[PDB]
Amino acid sequence: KFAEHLSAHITPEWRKQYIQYEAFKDMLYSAQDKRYFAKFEEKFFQTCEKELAKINTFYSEKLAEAQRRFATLQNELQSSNIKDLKLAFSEFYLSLILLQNYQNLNFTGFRKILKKHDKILETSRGADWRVAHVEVAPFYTCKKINQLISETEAVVTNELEDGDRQKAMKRLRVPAPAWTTFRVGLFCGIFIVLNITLVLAAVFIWPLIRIYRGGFLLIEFLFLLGINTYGWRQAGVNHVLIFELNPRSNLSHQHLFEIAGFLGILWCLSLLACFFAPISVIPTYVYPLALYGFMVFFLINPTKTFYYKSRFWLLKLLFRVFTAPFHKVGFADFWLADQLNSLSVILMDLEYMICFYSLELICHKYTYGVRAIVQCIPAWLRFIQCLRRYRDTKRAFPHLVNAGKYSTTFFMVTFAALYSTHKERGHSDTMVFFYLWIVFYIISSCYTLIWDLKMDWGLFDKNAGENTFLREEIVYPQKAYYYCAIIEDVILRFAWTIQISITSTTLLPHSGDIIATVFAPLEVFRRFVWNFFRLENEHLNNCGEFR
Amino acid sequence: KFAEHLSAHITPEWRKQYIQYEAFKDMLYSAQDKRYFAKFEEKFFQTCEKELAKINTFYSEKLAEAQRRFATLQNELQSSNIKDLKLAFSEFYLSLILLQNYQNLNFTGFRKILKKHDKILETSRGADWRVAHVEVAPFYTCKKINQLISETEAVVTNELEDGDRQKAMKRLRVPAPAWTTFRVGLFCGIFIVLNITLVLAAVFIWPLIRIYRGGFLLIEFLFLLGINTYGWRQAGVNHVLIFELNPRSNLSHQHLFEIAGFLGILWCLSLLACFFAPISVIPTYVYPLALYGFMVFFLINPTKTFYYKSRFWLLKLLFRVFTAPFHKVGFADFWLADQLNSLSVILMDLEYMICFYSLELICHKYTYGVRAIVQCIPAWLRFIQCLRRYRDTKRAFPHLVNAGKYSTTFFMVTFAALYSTHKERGHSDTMVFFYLWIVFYIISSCYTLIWDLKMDWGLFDKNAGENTFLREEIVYPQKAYYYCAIIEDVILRFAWTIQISITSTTLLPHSGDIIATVFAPLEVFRRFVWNFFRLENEHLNNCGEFR
Numbered sequence A, B: 001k002f003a004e005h006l007s008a009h010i011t012p013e014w015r016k017q018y019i020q021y022e023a024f025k026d027m028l029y030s031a032q033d034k035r036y037f038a039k040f041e042e043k044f045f046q047t048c049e050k051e052l053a054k055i056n057t058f059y060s061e062k063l064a065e066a067q068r069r070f071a072t073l074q075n076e077l078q079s080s081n082i083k084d085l086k087l088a089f090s091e092f093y094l095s096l097i098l099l100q101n102y103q104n105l106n107f108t109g110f111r112k113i114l115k116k117h118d119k120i121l122e123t124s125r126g127a128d129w130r131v132a133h134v135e136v137a138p139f140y141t142c143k144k145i146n147q148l149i150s151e152t153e154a155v156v157t158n159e160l161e162d163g164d165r166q167k168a169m170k171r172l173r174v175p176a177p178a179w180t181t182f183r184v185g186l187f188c189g190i191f192i193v194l195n196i197t198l199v200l201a202a203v204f205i206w207p208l209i210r211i212y213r214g215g216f217l218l219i220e221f222l223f224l225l226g227i228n229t230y231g232w233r234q235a236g237v238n239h240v241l242i243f244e245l246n247p248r249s250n251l252s253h254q255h256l257f258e259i260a261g262f263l264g265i266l267w268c269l270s271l272l273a274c275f276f277a278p279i280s281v282i283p284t285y286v287y288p289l290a291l292y293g294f295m296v297f298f299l300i301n302p303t304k305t306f307y308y309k310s311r312f313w314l315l316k317l318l319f320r321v322f323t324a325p326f327h328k329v330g331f332a333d334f335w336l337a338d339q340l341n342s343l344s345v346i347l348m349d350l351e352y353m354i355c356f357y358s359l360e361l362i363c364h365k366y367t368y369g370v371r372a373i374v375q376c377i378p379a380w381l382r383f384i385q386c387l388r389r390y391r392d393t394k395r396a397f398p399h400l401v402n403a404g405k406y407s408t409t410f411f412m413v414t415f416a417a418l419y420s421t422h423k424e425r426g427h428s429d430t431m432v433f434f435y436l437w438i439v440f441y442i443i444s445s446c447y448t449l450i451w452d453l454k455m456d457w458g459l460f461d462k463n464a465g466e467n468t469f470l471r472e473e474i475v476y477p478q479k480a481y482y483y484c485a486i487i488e489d490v491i492l493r494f495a496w497t498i499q500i501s502i503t504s505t506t507l508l509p510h511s512g513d514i515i516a517t518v519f520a521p522l523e524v525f526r527r528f529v530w531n532f533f534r535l536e537n538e539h540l541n542n543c544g545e546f547r
């Protein structure tokens, strides 16, 4: 069972130089089927000798090659792109490890085959020839690879790692805790009690339901995204690959639950301070500023603490999203920019908070239209991202019809705002504008719903078969989930568009903010659900085509 | 390296019947140092033949023995102490597994030694004799042990386990989670916020600082005992052995943290309901009753849920403590009954709560002396436990001087109460009684302190050497701990006695309840500390002598 081990661990590149162990076993078998045995031993040992010679030659060649490579590498390092030199060093070390493995495999193989010969031929001169020719010859007796590996570890540690031996050991030959679950629980408990205190304080404002709706939607989105990370990692959907995250260290669901719990503790504490007004030297309007200043400082924290790698990945992702038509559209850039299409209320509320704190401390009506643009920003991002994807791949259908799906948000918002500004000023064409808004509402709702179900989710496939109205490969355990989500998306895709249109117009105040406050945390739920089946379709059928 | 494996895994009892592998290797070595080889092979194979014969005979004998044993076992089970029959079944199964291991070891050993002979003697007839005599003979070809083991598993599962195969697999051949840490965190968070709400409610009663001091001391004791369990398990101090707990499943520190956190949530909720009086159909005095009714129902919960095995171990332990002079003094019975010497305030407060709810809803003064007895109950327990240990072991010194250490609590409490009842009634002998109380206070304080430091802690040993003023073997990492604890115990052992004496007398009201409320959670801390070094001395020097 060494032949299988060899053929499985043999180096693809040097598949020749390895001892033809299977061929030697074939030779021995054919032999076992005085002169006969004598001449067989003669020819067989001649074959072993030329094999040993070949291994010696190849080992010497690649040893000299690695010697020169280490020489050029030490020169180029002495010259001072630095991470590129690090990568070259790691490649060289991997090559050295591979060659050492080759040497060990050949040694073990020679011993095993010679032992097989000894046992089969009932002759002890086999091990004699072993200890005579092998173990006294180069490619086994030589240890230059050992010292090369030693000097390489030393040089990377003292130049590149500057003395951090363990981190160098991680950089080379490289193959949720208890405290994090405890903190997830701590923050969920503090958050539960603070929410109960919040409800009890409310029982025993609209410029303050608009400044905390932002925080509420963001924290709900982070909790639900932690649930998404869990429900992906537990159905095998490799999100680590699709997002292009470092597969060694990435956030689990407990780290998202902990980030969301902490931000929720901050939100609840600020809201409480707004109710049970503590020390009255500082007014009420300072707690929203303190809350969002703390959130933004947690995001752009310069010191490498508190999820530094995660926060800065997110910051690069946001920079690449908001300056959209320039960077090439990854998948994280398509995912994020398609989840500001549901957190559009966070942008509306940031804009309203800026307005209010500047001018009202009017702002909720169309601030000359600055409130109808900041609503179409997260549809503009995706419109132009799909336009760039069409400019790159030059595939007309998916990307052009995608951009046509997001243009309907522009048209719907525009016609809602125009019909509003016309009805309040009592023009004649108000009914015409209302008809146009109704048409484009139906269009955008059906457009986005159809696209969701067909291209985003892959459902309604025609190779359905047993999985009625779905695709063939389903990853989620109970088939009720997909029907629940189909019904849910049909319902909550008209809700989202009606909420956008209503938030544009100033016609229905009161019922223009109990709607945009009871429909806004529903549409983050709808995005939390769409995440499941979009990432599933990306894993299975690669509908996005980012890899 | 098979000889070492054999000698390590050979059955102690049947050490003869196993193949003398080492002797065979000695024989082969002495041989390798035509007629010579021929006659050596003859005699060697004769030895192997008689060895095989011996193994066959012994295997047949023990197979018939196990057959009859299974027969008697099935009879006795058919007859219907039941757990005793279960234990007998497990013993039989272990014997069967041991005999099967014997068979496998002999097979492997015979193959290995015959292979050694084959390789050394350059003769292939070795494996021929192997396959001829062995593998065609009983003790290898027989499989009766397999079916016996099968029928045994089946019979235990269907009669004793009634169909629970996996639990039977646990009962035979038998060798903190994530959710528990999450719940520890949840309960600690809820508890933190409820305590902050508590302090804020108090800022914005003595019959109610006496009904919640019980709960507070109990919850503090459970938190600190969880810390004790951790600091034991992390310094290797085998508390699982000393307490005689089931070493397979015992409580970690996180389960004590979770029990204490839950009871603390109940305490804080009841106290809050006493402050922010909710629905006023139910008065205030119903929350203490609800709290302690819930705690007692959590303890004596009949259904097997919520730490059933732990709670019922504790209930048996308490039954064995409170009816003291009868049961033999284990170690858990000495530990518990020596930790009601510090939770004496929980008993005082239970008695005061009964008094109050019966008569005052007077009670805090000596209720005709029922308040000076319920203080000496947890010293009476230990007095009589040490008396029984002296009656059993008939070792005068440790147990008699122990009971003399606990009699001083009786004398101190008695003289405090008498001097009080004499001074308030203005007798002449009040100063005499005060002198007697002072004498016995000094006596009890110094007595218990000296005993703590010397016999309970083992410190002040005279083989100290480098560990000044301590013993030789220390288990706790930093030597500052032992000096901190020496100083702490010296301080807080006068505090405890002054608090007991004060709680006896009614002379210093106000300062008779800010003292018994600021000294009571200090003396549970002192017991939490004494736990560390008492259990350490029990692990190391076995000062208690319970095993």
Ligand SMILES: O=P(O)(O)O[C@H]1[C@@H](OP(=O)(O)O)[C@H](OP(=O)(O)OP(=O)(O)O)[C@@H](OP(=O)(O)O)[C@H](OP(=O)(O)OP(=O)(O)O)[C@@H]1OP(=O)(O)O
Pocket (backbone or CB within 6 Å): A001, A002, A003, A005, A112, A115, B115
């Ligand atoms: O049964 P055979 O003769 O056809 O197989 C051989 C077997 O001889 P046997 O009859 O059991 O005495 C063992 O030889 P041996 O006692 O000298 O042992 P050493 O090699 O010196 O240790 C050896 O097992 P092993 O002891 O290494 O584990 C095994 O090597 P290999 O495959 O690497 O083993 P596995 O990968 O299967 O474990 C041999 O080669 P194959 O034919 O390829 O299997």
Ligand SMILES: O=P(O)(O)O[C@H]1[C@@H](OP(=O)(O)O)[C@H](OP(=O)(O)OP(=O)(O)O)[C@@H](OP(=O)(O)O)[C@H](OP(=O)(O)OP(=O)(O)O)[C@@H]1OP(=O)(O)O
Pocket (backbone or CB within 6 Å): A083, A246
């Ligand atoms: O060098 P900087 O500061 O500009 O950049 C970072 C680098 O700094 P440093 O070398 O320590 O001074 C490492 O930081 P760090 O040690 O805190 O992190 P670790 O504890 O080592 O994780 C980090 O290591 P690591 O994430 O690969 O393990 C590396 O990840 P990067 O290679 O992007 O990751 P991949 O592309 O391989 O996925 C970062 O980006 P680079 O610039 O590409 O190196």
Ligand SMILES: O=P(O)(O)O[C@H]1[C@@H](OP(=O)(O)O)[C@H](OP(=O)(O)OP(=O)(O)O)[C@@H](OP(=O)(O)O)[C@H](OP(=O)(O)OP(=O)(O)O)[C@@H]1OP(=O)(O)O
Pocket (backbone or CB within 6 Å): A115, B001, B002, B003, B005, B112, B115
């Ligand atoms: O070299 P020797 O003569 O001193 O040691 C023997 C060795 O010979 P070789 O290496 O071929 O020259 C191996 O023979 P073999 O491959 O035919 O045996 P198999 O039938 O294949 O098992 C065998 O290794 P291995 O194959 O079990 O892995 C080893 O078993 P042993 O170490 O007891 O077992 P472990 O203690 O390692 O578990 C033998 O026994 P010893 O003398 O006690 O060491």
Ligand SMILES: O=P(O)(O)O[C@H]1[C@@H](OP(=O)(O)O)[C@H](OP(=O)(O)OP(=O)(O)O)[C@@H](OP(=O)(O)O)[C@H](OP(=O)(O)OP(=O)(O)O)[C@@H]1OP(=O)(O)O
Pocket (backbone or CB within 6 Å): B083, B246
């Ligand atoms: O039989 P009952 O009801 O009167 O007593 C219990 C027994 O009931 P059952 O057999 O299931 O009907 C088992 O309950 P269970 O299965 O819920 O617990 P498990 O899930 O199996 O743990 C338990 O098993 P287990 O603790 O040993 O594993 C056993 O522990 P006990 O032997 O004391 O422990 P040790 O003396 O060996 O330390 C209890 O005491 P016994 O009376 O001595 O058996």
